[PDB]
């Protein structure tokens, strides 16, 4: 009786037991438990996956079937599906029981739990949808719920303007996703998962490039690749568990997921896989520089997100997408931890600044969340002890994976990315914990109160980052791939260069110790170099000038209203119909109106003389050359 | 028998004791809903014009029994879906305008009920004569409804109707005259059969085409529409019936199959470019415009522009997506216009946006009926519309891939409307209004909620009353 | 006054040399971070529009 | 249930309008029959795939052969044109 629909519909009740709310509190202690009981039965299903059947949930309905298509509400739960669902159930559950004591006071505080729970519902139907249609249903619901959700507040800039440039930049992926879906339905019939995997044996083995780069535009838009990536930084400024779902497991992660359920056709188009490589190769370095500079700790973790998925984009570009799947699981468990850690330390400080320059003591002045985010930071730095050694340093091995040539460059690219990934965590950790006390507000231990059982969210995910690395050892394993005999990462696993394979972590330890050595000697932040270093840190602090999109949007809204200026030229095709006729009226009434009250005989008599003369003369003009048609056109010059 | 409703006309004559003449005018349309619903229990299969009535009575004055049927032949067919679009909307206008009658007179309801029956007869028409005699008989009632009861400069507003949608109309008169003088017959339900050769099959296409260009607007004139929408008189049919009056996509589907079996010479080099740059330009016209009704009027132009490239696709997916936009937009957009008119104009009397912003902080559930409804206009992952413009983009991409490859930016420009609109509608200051009143009027809640459920309940696409490619394809 | 205005505007240009994109932003300020995370809505009387309401 | 008799549309001289309607009815039914055959093909292909695991080339190719043969056909009905004097496209 514990069927797969209880893995979905229970989360749906999270909306329906909150639409008929009438309960100012208590929606926590009901709805969060209602997500917990989904999470544990999904774990029971994952434990049940020794046998590896496929529960199809197909006749929910039939959506439409007219000619050569049959979209059904199809729900198969695959091995590729379960990794992401055991991510999002765990992350969502821990956000739920993280969100209880935090964000307790609001003018409306039930809408928050309700929206993120029903968001988890549309995220899970995004993942478990067995076609491309329900894939779109979830993949579009999550963004337009994020419009309502990251704008949970009703403030000026940091949410309400921000939700537009979040969702509209999602919408740039939405439109070309619909375009690629149209090319799917021209080429393929069923528009599912099942038939499409069988149809990689094409008519003539054609291009298929406009199948997948159209969806890769969405894989730029979702999963925040460099063509448009400012919206993570701009949708950062919602409340912090929203940003937790935004960067760890749900929002930014579907952009890899629609690549993964389309892993069949990546294996038959290398020409898109090459740009899949190099775009993420650009994003790793871009994220590295911006999260070096900009001093908002939520921005540092938010750019650490796109850094850690840039080499996942490289990994799917290197066909070893099992490693990409495992890394998405591990990264989800990472920024599950570090976000609610940062939300805890924001909550404890009275000022609640999102800076780093005002913190000083995450020493024994507040030591617990330091230990938790220390675990999570060593987790980010690919340290050898835990799943950071597993979630990375196998992707960077795959960069060296030499079934591809002209591939040696991205090893160094990801190497620089990993060094910068280490200096992220060191940059925040010294400035929070080992630095001198920065802001003298909350002086006499006014931040000493540590939050409210928020240990219990953080402790389970800390276990799932420390010793869940032993678990899920996938790198000779089945795990439902497609794998078209190109690379298979076998040569990448066996005997790369020891001066390369071992250097990637020794440099990590060296750079971590060096950024820790900025305490005893302070010149990295110093020296105030105007002509070189100041402008460099400025131009890398403004999101690598992603505000050049303000030379792309607000430099064309003016063109969008020059379109309005043109649309008034269309009234200039109608205004004169009420104006040039209103000159024609005075022109027609001014002729033969010399006296016009007296003497009106003479006007009319000379007029009918002109009538018979002009008409007989124009009969003479007619029957000699009929082409001469100016004598009427000059008469239209009067009226 | 015969006089069973003339006795009810005596009931209507004595019913003016209670001097409203409104509740009877609502119960009449309420009975008309069932009188169409029982009629929906007949059109089973076999794809011919099921019912029949002549109603111009060649050998009578009101009957249908002859052998020389020189009459109007008003009847039903697979049009009936639009009729099932119609009769659940006709009371829903009046109930949406039940309070703000603006007591100059009661006959406003009689005008709205009148055009509500007239476009039902438009959908019940069959012949070119019969379709034309109903296709503009709305317009005097439209003109009286704009001229009195409007808010803005009615002398500017009402004349644009009888300029433009009479202009394209009596251009359509040319094509109707020419095909009625070639065929000497006009039974469009019975004549998908003509040896009409091209180059005189072409100019009749032009004469029909610029007509429907005027009705469902394109970039040669589309300013026809939004100033009718600007001075929009009296919430119930300020827009809503003139929003269903641009379901002259029934003209482009009912006509233009049965004697335009050869019109591919002007299918792709004319309709697709004139559609595509509307969906670019006219949808791009909603950035700086400040009237609250004009920005959804242009959205209506955009949705119909999507739908007609679906129409001209020669694929059954395109036709069916067009028809389901014809019901879907006619669900979502009358709800939005009832929002801005019935409970957001009447609270404030002002339709600009610049000092209008700030909601959700004293009208809570108004914003919840705003954002999902604006998403249902956005494109919406579920069926408020989606499968409409989805299948329309499918057919448009099938017939020509490049213009569809630009036309998929419709979803971006659909977002550009409402998601500029909504966040600078619900931004929490509201410092120029005085915290007006209750949001849902408890019957306005019903009128918005019926259209909301009617949008959302098209999830399982019900195509039962449409053998879709019955007569619109080519080899 | 000439040299004073000279050095004052020279230090003004020197001040613009060290413009900084990412300021301190104390939380109550309009810098944004705490700025009106939930506005306390002022309580006014509802004014019913329609007579039949 | 019921099975109307096909009329062979090209054969009846276009005034006996009940026969014309029954001809176009029958032609559209024949369109839907080949469509439902295509649906049978897809329902077979999904079962071949989910039985196959990785076994595309084993026993699932020969479905896909006549699948991508049958898909550009079996779609539309139009009208059986009179003379086809002018071709294009
Ligand atoms: C015979 C033709 C005229 C029918 C008159 C209507 C029959 C009685 C129904 C009725 O009582 O309608 C009430 C309304 C006047 O109501 P009242 O408020 O008492 O008076 C006005 C206030 N000074 O009276 C009305 O509502 C006016 C009637 C509305 C129909 C007029 C249509 C005007 C536009 C013409 C378009 C083209 C003609 C279409 C042909 C339709 C023929 C039925």
Swiss-Prot record, chain A:
Top-level EC class as recorded in UniProt: translocase
This protein's record includes keyword GTP-binding: no
Any one Gene Ontology cellular component term annotated for this protein: respiratory chain complex I
Superkingdom field: Eukaryota
Catalytic activity: a ubiquinone + NADH + 5 H(+)(in) = a ubiquinol + NAD(+) + 4 H(+)(out)
EC number: 7.1.1.2
Membrane topology, from the record: Multi-pass membrane protein
Segments traversing the membrane: 1-19, 30-50, 80-100, 112-132, 133-153, 176-196, 200-220, 240-260, 272-292, 300-318, 328-350, 366-386, 409-429, 452-472, 503-523, 616-636
Alphabetical UniProt keywords: Electron transport, Membrane, Mitochondrion, Mitochondrion inner membrane, NAD, Respiratory chain, Translocase, Transmembrane, Transmembrane helix, Transport, Ubiquinone
Entry-linked Pfam families: Proton_antipo_M (PF00361), Proton_antipo_N (PF00662)
One GO MF term: NADH dehydrogenase (ubiquinone) activity
Keyword Zinc in annotation: no
GO biological process terms held by the UniProt record: ATP synthesis coupled electron transport; electron transport coupled proton transport
NCBIfam families, alphabetized: NDH_I_L (TIGR01974)
Function, in words: Core subunit of the mitochondrial membrane respiratory chain NADH dehydrogenase (Complex I) that is believed to belong to the minimal assembly required for catalysis. Complex I functions in the transfer of electrons from NADH to the respiratory chain. The immediate electron acceptor for the enzyme is believed to be ubiquinone.
Assembly notes: Complex I is composed of 37 different subunits.
Identification of the protein by name: NADH-ubiquinone oxidoreductase chain 5
Provenance organism: Yarrowia lipolytica (strain CLIB 122 / E 150)
UniProt gene name: ND5
Swiss-Prot record, chain B:
Subcellular location: Mitochondrion membrane
Keyword Translocase belongs to the record: yes
Pfam families registered for this protein in UniProt: Proton_antipo_M (PF00361)
Presence of keyword Mitochondrion: yes
Signal peptide bounds: none
Key words of the record: Electron transport, Membrane, Mitochondrion, NAD, Respiratory chain, Translocase, Transmembrane, Transmembrane helix, Transport, Ubiquinone
Protein name listed in UniProt: NADH-ubiquinone oxidoreductase chain 4
Any GO MF annotation of the entry: NADH dehydrogenase (ubiquinone) activity
Reactions catalysed, as given in the entry: a ubiquinone + NADH + 5 H(+)(in) = a ubiquinol + NAD(+) + 4 H(+)(out)
Source species of the chain: Yarrowia lipolytica (strain CLIB 122 / E 150)
EC number: 7.1.1.2
Subunit description: Complex I is composed of 37 different subunits.
Protein task: Core subunit of the mitochondrial membrane respiratory chain NADH dehydrogenase (Complex I) that is believed to belong to the minimal assembly required for catalysis. Complex I functions in the transfer of electrons from NADH to the respiratory chain. The immediate electron acceptor for the enzyme is believed to be ubiquinone.
Membrane-topology descriptor: Multi-pass membrane protein
Gene Ontology CC annotations of this record: mitochondrial membrane; respiratory chain complex I
């Amino acid at each position: 009786i514990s069927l797969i629909i209880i893995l979905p519909c229970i989360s749906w009740l999270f909306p329906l037991f909150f639409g008929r709310q009438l309960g100012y509190v208590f929606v926590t202690r009901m709805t969060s438990t209602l997500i917990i009981i989904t999470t544990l039965i999904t774990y029971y299903y994952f434990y049940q996956l020794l046998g590896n059947n496929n529960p199809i949930n197909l006749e929910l309905f039939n959506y439409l079937n007219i000619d050569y298509l049959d979209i059904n509400y199809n729900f198969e739960i695959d091995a590729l599906t379960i990794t992401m669902l055991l991510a999002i159930t765990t992350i969502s559950s821990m956000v739920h029981i993280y969100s209880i004591g935090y964000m307790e006071t609001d003018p409306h505080q039930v809408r928050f739990f309700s929206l993120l729970s029903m968001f988890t519902f549309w995220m899970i139907i995004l993942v478990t949808g067995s076609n491309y249609f329900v894939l779109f249903v979830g993949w579009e619901f999550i963004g337009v719920t994020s419009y309502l959700l990251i704008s949970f507040w009703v403030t000026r800039l940091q949410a309400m303007k921000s939700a537009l440039s979040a969702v509209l930049m999602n919408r740039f992926g939405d439109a070309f996703f619909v375009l690629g879906l149209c090319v799917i339905a021209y080429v393929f019939g069923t528009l599912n998962y099942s038939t499409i995997f069988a149809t990689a044996y094409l008519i003539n083995t054609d291009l298929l490039v406009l199948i997948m780069l159209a969806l890769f535009i969405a894989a730029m838009a979702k999963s925040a690749q460099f063509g448009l990536h400012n919206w993570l930084t701009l949708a950062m400024e919602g409340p912090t568990p929203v940003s937790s779902l935004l960067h760890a497991a749900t929002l930014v992660t579907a952009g890899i997921y629609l690549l993964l359920r389309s892993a069949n056709i990546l294996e038959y188009t290398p020409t898109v896989l090459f740009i899949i490589l190099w775009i993420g190769a650009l994003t790793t370095l871009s994220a590295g520089l911006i999260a070096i500079c900009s001093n908002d700790l939520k921005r540092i973790i938010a750019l650490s997100t796109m850094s850690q998925l840039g080499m996942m984009t490289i990994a799917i570009g290197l066909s070893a997408y099992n490693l990409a799947l495992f890394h998405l699981l591990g990264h989800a468990f990472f920024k599950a931890l570090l976000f609610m850690s940062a939300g805890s330390i924001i909550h404890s400080i009275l000022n609640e600044s999102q800076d780093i320059r005002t913190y000083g003591g995450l020493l024994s002045y507040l030591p617990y969340t330091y230990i938790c985010i220390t675990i999570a930071s060593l987790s980010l730095m690919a340290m050898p002890g835990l799943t950071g050694y597993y979630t990375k340093d196998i992707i960077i091995e795959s960069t060296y994976g030499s079934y591809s040539i002209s591939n040696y460059v991205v090893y160094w690219i990801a190497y620089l990315s990993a060094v910068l990934t280490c200096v992220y965590s060191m940059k925040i950790l010294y400035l929070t914990f080992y630095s001198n006390p920065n802001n003298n507000t909350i002086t006499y231990y006014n931040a000493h109160e540590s939050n409210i059982y928020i240990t219990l969210p953080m402790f389970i995910l800390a276990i799932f980052a420390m010793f869940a690395g032993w678990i899920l050892k996938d790198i000779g394993t089945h795990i439902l791939p497609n794998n078209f005999s190109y690379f298979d990462t076998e040569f990448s696993i066996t005997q790369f260069y020891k001066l390369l394979p071992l250097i990637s972590a020794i440099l990590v330890s060296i750079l971590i110790v060096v950024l820790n050595e900025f305490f005893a000697i302070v010149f990295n932040l110093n020296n105030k170099y105007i002509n070189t270093v100041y402008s460099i840190f400025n131009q890398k602090l403004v999101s690598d000038q992603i505000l050049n999109h303000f030379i792309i949007f607000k430099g064309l809204v003016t063109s969008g209203n020059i379109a309005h200026h043109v649309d008034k030229g269309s009234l200039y095709r109608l205004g004169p119909v009420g104006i040039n006729r209103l000159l024609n009226k005075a022109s027609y009434n001014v002729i033969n109106l010399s006296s016009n009250t007296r003497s009106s005989l003479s006007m009319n008599s000379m007029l009918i003389l002109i009538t018979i003369v002009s008409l007989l003369l124009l009969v003479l003009v007619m029957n000699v050359n009929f082409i001469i048609v100016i004598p009427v056109l000059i008469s239209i010059l009067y009226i | 028998l015969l006089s069973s409703l003339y006795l009810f006309n005596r009931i209507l004559a004595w019913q003016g004791n209670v001097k409203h003449f409104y509740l009877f005018a609502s119960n009449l349309l309420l009975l008309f809903i069932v009188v169409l619903y029982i009629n929906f229990n007949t059109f089973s299969n076999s794809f011919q014009f099921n019912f029949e009535l002549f109603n111009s009575l060649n050998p009578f004055g009101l009957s249908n029994s002859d052998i020389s049927n020189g009459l109007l032949f008003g009847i039903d067919g697979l049009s009936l879906t639009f009729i099932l679009l119609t009769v659940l909307l006709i009371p829903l206008t009046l109930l949406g305008n039940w309070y703000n009658i603006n007591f100059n007179s009661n006959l406003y309801y009689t005008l709205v009920l009148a055009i509500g029956l007239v476009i039902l007869l438009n959908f019940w028409a069959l012949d070119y004569i019969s379709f034309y005699i109903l296709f503009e008989a709305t317009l005097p009632l439209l003109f009286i409804l704009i001229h009195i009861y409007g808010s803005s400069d009615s002398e500017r507003a009402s004349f644009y109707v009888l300029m433009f949608t009479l202009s394209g109309s009596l251009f359509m008169l040319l094509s109707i005259v020419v095909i009625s003088i070639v065929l000497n017959t006009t039974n469009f339900i019975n004549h998908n059969l003509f040896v009409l050769s091209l180059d005189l099959q072409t100019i009749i296409w032009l004469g029909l085409f610029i007509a429907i260009m005027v009705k469902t607007p394109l970039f040669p004139i589309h300013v026809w529409l939004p100033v009718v929408h600007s001075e929009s008189p009296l919430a119930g049919s300020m827009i809503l019936a003139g929003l269903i009056l641009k379901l002259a996509l029934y003209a482009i589907l009912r006509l233009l199959l049965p004697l335009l079996c050869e019109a591919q010479i002007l299918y792709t080099p004319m309709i697709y470019i004139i559609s595509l740059l509307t969906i670019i330009l006219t949808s791009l016209a909603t950035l700086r415009q400040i009237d609250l009704k004009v920005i959804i009027a242009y959205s209506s132009i955009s949705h119909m522009g999507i739908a007609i490239l679906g129409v001209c696709s020669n694929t059954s997916l395109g036709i069916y997506g067009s028809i389901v936009l014809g019901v879907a937009h006619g669900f979502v957009s009358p709800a939005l216009f009832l929002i801005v008119g019935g409970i957001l104009y009447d609270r404030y009397h002002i339709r600009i946006v610049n000092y209008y912003k700030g909601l959700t902080t004293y009208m809570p559930q108004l914003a919840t009926y705003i954002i999902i409804l604006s998403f249902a206009n956005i494109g919406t992952p579920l069926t408020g519309n989606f499968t409409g413009e989805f299948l329309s983009l499918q057919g448009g991409f099938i017939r020509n891939p490049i213009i569809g490859g630009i036309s998929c930016i419709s979803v971006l420009l659909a977002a550009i409307y409402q998601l500029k609109l909504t966040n600078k509608l619900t931004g929490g200051i509201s410092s120029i209004y005085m915290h007006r009143t209750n949001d849902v009027t408890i019957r306005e809640k019903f009128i918005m909620n019926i259209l909301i459920i009617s949008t959302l309940i098209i999830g399982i696409c019900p195509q039962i009353m449409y053998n879709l490619l019955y007569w619109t394809v080519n080899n | 006054p000439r040299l004073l205005a000279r050095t004052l505007d020279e230090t003004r240009a020197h001040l613009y040399e060290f413009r900084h994109p990412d300021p301190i932003v104390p939380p109550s300020f309009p810098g944004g971070t705490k700025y009106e995370r939930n506005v306390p809505p002022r309580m006014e009387k509802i004014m019913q529009h329609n007579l039949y309401e | 249930h019921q099975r109307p008799e096909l009329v062979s549309f090209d054969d009846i001289n276009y005034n006996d309008h009940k026969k014309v309607r029954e001809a176009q009815e029958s032609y559209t039914r024949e369109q839907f029959i080949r469509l439902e055959a295509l649906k049978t093909v897809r329902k077979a292909l999904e079962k071949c795939y989910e039985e196959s695991g990785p076994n595309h080339f084993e026993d699932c190719k020969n479905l896909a052969e006549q699948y991508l043969d049958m898909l550009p056909t079996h779609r539309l009905q139009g009208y059986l044109g009179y003379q086809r004097n002018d071709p294009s496209k």
